[PDB]
Structure 1
Amino acid sequence: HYIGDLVQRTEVELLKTPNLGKKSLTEIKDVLASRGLSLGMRLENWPPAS
């Protein structure tokens, strides 16, 4: 749902998931990179009581 949840997902997990090809993963990485973010980050004590 949130950017915080997506950012923690790694590239391999989002490659193995069904209905998500290489183009969609690349577009996700592109829209993340537009804001200086990347997949594979790690966060502690998430979510903060949404």
Structure 2
Amino acid sequence: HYIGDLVQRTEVELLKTPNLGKKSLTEIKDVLASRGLSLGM
């Protein structure tokens, strides 16, 4: 629900989620990077 929940998940965990493609993972990284955040903090 929150950005703080998303930032704790690893890239390998997000790829296990249902309806989660490589394209949507790249979108999430690019958007988090635009805000100075990274996956796995």
TM tier, smaller: over 0.9
Identity %: 100
Give the structure with higher Rg (CA). 1
Equivalenced residue count is 41
RMSD: 0.5
Tell me the CA shift for residue 18 of structure 1: 1.5
Moved over 2 A (4+): none
Higher relative contact order (Cα pairs below 8 Å, separated by 6+ residues)? 2
Structure 2 unpaired stretches of 5+:
none
Give the TM-score taking structure 1 as reference length: 0.78
CA deviation digits over 1:9-49, x for unaligned, max 9?
000000111200000000001100001100001xxxxxxxx
Structure 1 unpaired stretches of 5+:
42-50
More helix by share: 2
